Amino acid sequence: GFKQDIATIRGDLRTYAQDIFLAFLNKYPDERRYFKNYVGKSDQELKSMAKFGDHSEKVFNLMMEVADRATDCVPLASDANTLVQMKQHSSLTTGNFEKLFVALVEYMRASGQSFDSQSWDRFGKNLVSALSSAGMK
Ligand code: HEM
């Protein structure tokens, strides 16, 4: 289930973090505008960039912590507040996060592994709700 899925992802994090981030950017190519130097590149070109894998890894490091600190897929209010207050996240709305979770859930469903997809959907939605309460537009 959800808790196990956290260990699963953490066990092979760089691969999972990149595969899922790439699924997100490929599902929604216009999200690349929030980042630097992503446009004009294929998955492999992205994966060989200096900072791409390292970035996706940090994102998923924190996501897994947030999911881990959650109860019944409900994230802590303080974890949401951190995501809202991050300088790197200042121009974002909750829509950006729900897109990431849509891509994440779809990735899980398409893969071999036995992810509790519905739980990640629920967590994604609960996180979006908490980001709103924390003041994100
Ligand atoms: C649960 C969801 C998310 C988590 C846990 C998360 C986490 C992070 C972390 C930890 C960093 C900084 C890494 C570092 O200091 O090197 C970061 C940076 C950043 N994030 Fe997120 N993020 C999330 C969602 C998103 C989404 C959906 C977007 C945009 C569509 C986004 C846009 C950015 C941007 C533009 C940066 C700065 C990249 C850079 O400075 O090189 N984040 N995020």
Tokens representing 10?
């953490």
Q: Which of 78, 80, 107 is nearest to 94 (CA)?
A: 80
Long-range contacts (CB closer than 8 Å, 24 or more residues apart) made by 117-125: 119/1, 119/2, 119/5, 119/73, 120/2, 120/5, 122/73, 123/2, 123/67, 123/70, 123/73, 123/75, 124/97, 124/98, 124/100, 125/98, 125/101
CA distance 118 to 1: 10
CATH no. for 1-137:
1.10.490.10
Dist. CA 56 → ligand 1 center (Å): 8
123 neighbors 79 (Cβ within 8 angstroms): no
The structure was resolved experimentally with X-ray
- What are the residue ranges spanned by the domains of the chain? 1-137
Dist. CA 4 → ligand 1 center (Å): 24
Q: Which residue has the tokens 């959907």?
A: 121
Residue 92: CB within 6 Å of ligand 1?
Answer: yes
Q: At what angle do helices 77-85 and 117-133 cross, to 10 degrees?
A: 70
CA distance 101 to 115: 14
Residue 8: CB within 6 Å of ligand 1?
Answer: no
89 neighbors 104 (Cβ within 8 angstroms): no
Q: What angle do CA 39, 127, 87 make, to 5 degrees?
A: 55
Tokens representing 104?
């994440």
73 neighbors 5 (Cβ within 8 angstroms): no
Residue 27: CB within 6 Å of ligand 1?
Answer: no
As a three-state string, the secondary structure of 78-113 is HHHHHHHHCHHHCCCCHHHHHHHHHHHHHHHHHCCC
Beta-carbon contacts of residue 136 (< 8 Å; ≥ 6 apart): 83, 84, 89, 92, 93, 94
Burial of 137 (0-12, 13-18, 19+ CB in 10 A): exposed
